[PDB]
Design an enzyme around this catalytic site. Structure first.
Site, PDB file in Angstrom:
ATOM      1  N   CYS A  78       0.847  -1.226   0.000  1.00  0.00           N
ATOM      2  CA  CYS A  78       0.000   0.000   0.000  1.00  0.00           C
ATOM      3  C   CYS A  78       0.862   1.247   0.000  1.00  0.00           C
ATOM      4  CB  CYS A  78      -0.905   0.026   1.230  1.00  0.00           C
ATOM      5  SG  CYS A  78      -1.840  -1.475   1.498  1.00  0.00           S
TER       6      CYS A  78
ATOM      7  N   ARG B  42      -4.835   6.621  -1.479  1.00  0.00           N
ATOM      8  CA  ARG B  42      -3.945   5.467  -1.390  1.00  0.00           C
ATOM      9  C   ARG B  42      -4.057   4.472  -2.538  1.00  0.00           C
ATOM     10  NH1 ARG B  42      -6.358   1.804   2.305  1.00  0.00           N
ATOM     11  NH2 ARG B  42      -4.465   0.510   2.192  1.00  0.00           N
TER      12      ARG B  42
ATOM     13  N   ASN C  53      -1.245  -1.896   5.384  1.00  0.00           N
ATOM     14  CA  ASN C  53      -0.626  -3.090   5.967  1.00  0.00           C
ATOM     15  C   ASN C  53       0.638  -2.765   6.762  1.00  0.00           C
ATOM     16  OD1 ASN C  53      -0.442  -5.929   6.475  1.00  0.00           O
ATOM     17  ND2 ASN C  53       1.017  -6.144   4.781  1.00  0.00           N
TER      18      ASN C  53
HETATM   19  C1  LIG Z   1      -8.713  -3.828   3.279  1.00  0.00           C
HETATM   20  C2  LIG Z   1      -8.327  -3.189   4.616  1.00  0.00           C
HETATM   21  C3  LIG Z   1      -6.877  -2.694   4.545  1.00  0.00           C
HETATM   22  C4  LIG Z   1      -5.859  -3.834   4.448  1.00  0.00           C
HETATM   23  C5  LIG Z   1      -4.550  -3.393   3.830  1.00  0.00           C
HETATM   24  O1  LIG Z   1      -4.457  -2.256   3.321  1.00  0.00           O
HETATM   25  O2  LIG Z   1      -3.599  -4.203   3.852  1.00  0.00           O
HETATM   26  C6  LIG Z   1      -8.560  -4.083   5.854  1.00  0.00           C
HETATM   27  C7  LIG Z   1      -8.386  -3.313   7.176  1.00  0.00           C
HETATM   28  C8  LIG Z   1      -9.195  -4.066   8.239  1.00  0.00           C
HETATM   29  C9  LIG Z   1      -9.700  -5.293   7.480  1.00  0.00           C
HETATM   30  C10 LIG Z   1     -10.863  -6.109   8.055  1.00  0.00           C
HETATM   31  C11 LIG Z   1     -10.614  -6.455   9.524  1.00  0.00           C
HETATM   32  C12 LIG Z   1     -11.528  -7.554  10.071  1.00  0.00           C
HETATM   33  C13 LIG Z   1     -11.639  -8.784   9.156  1.00  0.00           C
HETATM   34  C14 LIG Z   1     -10.359  -9.629   9.285  1.00  0.00           C
HETATM   35  C15 LIG Z   1     -10.353 -10.861   8.381  1.00  0.00           C
HETATM   36  O3  LIG Z   1      -9.065 -11.486   8.439  1.00  0.00           O
HETATM   37  C16 LIG Z   1     -10.657 -10.469   6.938  1.00  0.00           C
HETATM   38  C17 LIG Z   1     -11.964  -9.680   6.838  1.00  0.00           C
HETATM   39  C18 LIG Z   1     -12.005  -8.421   7.706  1.00  0.00           C
HETATM   40  C19 LIG Z   1     -13.435  -7.884   7.648  1.00  0.00           C
HETATM   41  C20 LIG Z   1     -11.007  -7.363   7.167  1.00  0.00           C
HETATM   42  C21 LIG Z   1     -11.199  -6.995   5.680  1.00  0.00           C
HETATM   43  C22 LIG Z   1     -10.086  -6.086   5.132  1.00  0.00           C
HETATM   44  O4  LIG Z   1      -8.870  -6.835   4.983  1.00  0.00           O
HETATM   45  C23 LIG Z   1      -9.880  -4.852   6.025  1.00  0.00           C
HETATM   46  C24 LIG Z   1     -11.089  -3.911   5.860  1.00  0.00           C
END
Ligand SMILES: C[C@H](CCC(=O)O)[C@H]1CC[C@H]2[C@@H]3CC[C@@H]4C[C@H](O)CC[C@]4(C)[C@H]3C[C@H](O)[C@]12C
Ligand SMILES: C[C@H](CCC(=O)O)[C@H]1CC[C@H]2[C@@H]3CC[C@@H]4C[C@H](O)CC[C@]4(C)[C@H]3C[C@H](O)[C@]12C
Ligand SMILES: C[C@H](CCC(=O)O)[C@H]1CC[C@H]2[C@@H]3CC[C@@H]4C[C@H](O)CC[C@]4(C)[C@H]3C[C@H](O)[C@]12C
Ligand SMILES: C[C@H](CCC(=O)O)[C@H]1CC[C@H]2[C@@H]3CC[C@@H]4C[C@H](O)CC[C@]4(C)[C@H]3C[C@H](O)[C@]12C
Lengths: 328, 328, 328, 328
Positions: free
Chosen positions: C1, C17, C81
């Site tokens: 990212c 981003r 990330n």
């Molecule tokens: C997509 C962003 C940003 C990630 C990045 O930029 O690397 C991330 C940030 C927080 C993330 C969520 C956190 C809770 C969950 C964790 C799970 O294991 C996968 C699904 C979910 C619902 C995630 C989905 C996604 O992966 C998100 C929304």
């Protein structure tokens, strides 16, 4: 500057450094016997040696100060430039073991027999910017300490605290901080010592044009960060592939790769920064080996040949006259 | 391998090389007097020296063959590995001056007194892949030739023709072809020997953390192309900034930077490629200086002390025993 | 990212981003009005928005969680990330403002109007590894926060503490820590945006073979550290030389340079890591601009066209269908 | 400039380029029907098209000249900057097929149906520096030619001869010569698309801090040589790992990586060198796709929708107005 610790094929421990400066510091190889009282005339501060000491340094205003050295117990210490991120206290801090910058190296070698002993003593230590004489600023420094156990530590005082790092890399250079360099190593996980002979680029066959294709991407400049990377991996490769071949000369081969060459590292004052000397201490044997920019023949001074129960400081002349073996 | 030509502060001309191989070639320093007939027993080919010769080589099947050397007139020649882009003829070409690969270096030194003389003789020359003995393949080679005028040339035979380049860089390594390396130098026009102390990155002040920030981007690996870049710029910097300081030891400092270190340049056969020796010939004086991986003390053999009108080949033993100056 | 903050020629503030992942997270563009109660069904934790929110995210187990977004007051936040050096507490810490990892971005946007307000609230904050549902581990994250004042901060929780850095670089990527990247910038003080047309290498004239010779040494790979360097200097160059030309498309040009391309960034699971989307928020106007790997046409969603006093979450479909303008 | 040839998942052939210049050349997308006589008013030279042509160019002094284009038979050609190593004859050479620099691209497209046909015609060809009008110097150029067979060639005229290279790399940039770049690829045989997750550095464990560790060492600047390396390997990686995923947008993703960004590539005249446009021709379908620095939405012009038996040149306006999809 570049510090290096290396274990030989016979199990002996080598520790030493490249000295990278654009000036002479009136250096000589200095021997100090046991029970010798060193008195600083300007501030009346005193140090009496417990252990005999041998290393490179200078006698300034009648007081000995070191660039690198060892004691009779096989403890070694080297002071390397640390111009950025360093912070000394202006005066003594109440409740701390306060050590003037110029005296730190000697304080380590004169008092302690091992890295473990030093680590304990540094827990409550503080490095203070007390001038050796007049109001002269102390050189910005950090230190590498190593002994006959093969353990190495790095000592860096910042605005936060006096940091003591375990050094599992076996090397040190200059700024930034030690933890920064350790993290920087992670960027080079893709390096390979083994030749990569070919690459199939679809319809095009790519062939290695010479030896060394696995290390492409290794930085080649003379900055502290680039030198740290080079020495770290050169050391690692030798231990991995040629542990049973490591001897005195190998130490010099490693450090030669990060040595500065006249003309190409120019300071803002338009002076050539050089690897003035390369030292290698055999810690078990108490032998200080070194060569210089001017004379590449290795010279040896054995502290154990001197009287450790002597009553005087003994100095040996810094050898900058090229020694050639005339065969015919 | 890395070849280097360098003029000293007194106007003398140094020429020599790093020998980068993973094996021993039973080398010795070989002196051949004037009017000495060298006979190859396998193919009955003969060479009688006009000029006396001194250099590193070996006597294979009773026949002398050289890695690098000079003659009494101040002409020097070095053979360096050239594994890619090389092409020798299988047999003699009608109408050409046909020179076997193994004999090229000796052919240059035994017959000619200057680079200009060699250039003229090479116009109609052809290098032929005749085995020195049996059916043994010749080493893939290209040559650097230099003399007391300061002029240097590079000799490379490809599938097209025998190329003779004017060498205004003062250096040579290995593959690709010389013109490729010269063009590659153009990619590094942005290099600076002078320290860059700061950079204003908008709201962020960037500060140099150590010396050498101007050369960031210099390649640090041991491939022929990377070594060519390093030696070219290290040489240039010394001549620009420290012309009046150039002496014998400076030659070794330059080549040390591109020297291979045990363990980190591993061949596909899992052997360590090393800078086995570093030679430096003072062309005017006829002195062959060298050190080795094992022994870093410089050894000197002066051809002018020998009988140039002698009747025998004279050899001197390759020094691989570390010579230390014991001070105390 | 890669996160980026950029001020336009008219004084507007862009923040957004690259999203670099090898998977889909069932993303949509999510609008949440004022006074909307978000209830997590698994842990019963609740959040009621003070300010209306717009950004990219997903609705997981009936609960909205964001990747990047802004509020009606011009505050923006992006989660990137942060796999190494991150450390969340296992449970709530007594006396702290405890924020679950999945809820941090929404917590910032729903509650605060400025970077200064957020900075104050973070002084006693702690990020806790509470699963959004079941026992699912939270993504390892750090955050960039920016507003209409042009000020940016970076939020990173380590094993030591919750760090809040002032971001004077205008960029963020991934691991290592922010202070590491800032120190790494110092290694590139020798970079130049201006063409270096020539270099006199003694007797050899070196000529630039094309535009861009000043930036030779810039790292070209897709690691977080290399991408940080590239975006930092590309941003700096545009502000220095073309401040009066900065508009929406320039933001995308900068981020395109550090975008991942299918096939060349392969994970250990043998999947292609891609820049899935690129978002750019005009903070003053409340417009969320974005394109995707599949469809490079920029799409716009204006939060101010929606009812900020509405009673429901509104979602807009993630556009991954290439939009071509057919001219004839 | 960067040229690229890429085969899609369905077996279609894409060919196009980044146009990297600091100026506008009054460009439009130009369609020329069959049997159309193009007359140069200054030198009275004439060309009558056999095949219909579509591409980017300009009408200078009433005469059409092209930057890149294709014909109705699926033959494509692009002219890219070639400032160093180029050599045109001052006048026509007796016995040769003499082609003025400005007319070469049109000469290829108007006359021939395949790469094989062009190769045969170029055997006796010579490119001559005849001004399009007045005494105006022609742009220094080399050409990439590609067709529906997937075969590509590179045309470069030097002081030696008119070189026609088989292009098995699928890419082209600028100076040096094509054979130089092909040899330069060999230096990067150590590159890896697959993640390198760890490296055991003796007593220190090294861990990848993010994705992309295998490509560390890839050059990141905007010089022709660095761009050549990047596009060559990005293309190779996509074909190796994602052959079945290659479509129109992938072409743009590859070229985006080597696109110039405002402010960071400054000429000696202090102007920003930009990727002004990116073109992608689907050779089988006769569709010219392109976007611009100002407008990133892809525009399509289908030559097969026009009258190939028409009697006039038809132009379409160069689109530099950002096209946004407003969702709400
Ligand atoms: C997509 C962003 C940003 C990630 C990045 O930029 O690397 C991330 C940030 C927080 C993330 C969520 C956190 C809770 C969950 C964790 C799970 O294991 C996968 C699904 C979910 C619902 C995630 C989905 C996604 O992966 C998100 C929304
Ligand atoms: C030579 C070493 C190591 C320096 C390095 O490696 O960069 C350093 C460490 C401490 C240094 C001394 C500290 C006190 C003095 C400071 C003066 O301003 C210069 C002379 C002195 C007497 C210094 C001389 C020399 O510069 C020393 C001995
Ligand atoms: C050592 C130099 C230089 C090689 C280099 O720099 O790479 C080379 C140049 C010519 C080489 C000789 C050529 C003929 C022989 C070929 C055999 O297969 C190995 C032994 C011999 C006798 C070689 C020994 C040695 O390898 C030489 C003398
Ligand atoms: C735009 C392409 C490609 C250039 C590149 O890729 O670098 C080039 C190729 C040939 C170029 C033309 C050649 C003749 C003219 C030369 C003049 O000095 C500038 C205007 C003209 C009419 C040029 C305009 C433009 O510069 C063209 C069409």
């Amino acid at each position: 500057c570049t510090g290096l610790a290396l274990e030989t094929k016979d199990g002996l421990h080598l520790f030493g450094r490249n000295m990278d400066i654009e000036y002479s510091f009136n250096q000589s190889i200095i021997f100090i016997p046991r029970n010798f009282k060193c008195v600083n005339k300007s501030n009346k501060k005193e140090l009496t040696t417990k252990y005999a000491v041998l290393g490179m340094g200078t006698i300034f205003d009648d007081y000995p100060t070191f660039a690198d050295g060892m004691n009779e117990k096989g403890l070694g210490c080297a002071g390397l430039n640390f111009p950025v991120y360093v912070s000394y206290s202006k005066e003594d801090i109440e409740g701390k073991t306060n050590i003037p910058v110029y005296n730190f190296l000697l304080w380590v070698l004169a008092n302690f027999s091992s890295v473990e002993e030093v680590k304990e003593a540094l827990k409550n230590a503080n490095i203070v910017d007390i001038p050796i004489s007049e109001n002269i600023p102390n050189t910005t420094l950090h230190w590498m300490i190593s002994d006959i156990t093969g353990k190495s530590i790095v000592v860096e005082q910042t605005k936060e605290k006096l940091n003591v790092f375990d050094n599992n890399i076996g090397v040190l250079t200059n700024s930034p901080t030690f933890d920064w360099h350790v993290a920087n190593l992670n960027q080079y996980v893709g390096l390979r010592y083994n030749q990569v002979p070919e690459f199939k680029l679809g319809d095009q066959s790519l062939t290695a044009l010479g030896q060394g294709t696995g290390l492409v991407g290794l930085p080649g400049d003379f900055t502290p960060a680039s030198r740290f990377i080079r020495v770290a991996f050169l050391r690692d490769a030798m231990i991995k592939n040629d542990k049973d071949s490591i001897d005195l000369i190998e130490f010099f081969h490693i450090l030669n790769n990060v040595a500065m060459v006249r003309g190409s590292t120019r300071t803002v004052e338009e002076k050539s920064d050089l690897t003035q000397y390369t030292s290698c201490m055999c810690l078990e044997k108490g032998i200080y080996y070194y060569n210089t920019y001017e004379n590449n023949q290795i010279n040896a001074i054995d502290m154990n040949k001197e009287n450790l129960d002597g009553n005087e400081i003994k100095t040996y002349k810094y050898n900058k006259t090229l020694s050639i073996n005339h065969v015919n």
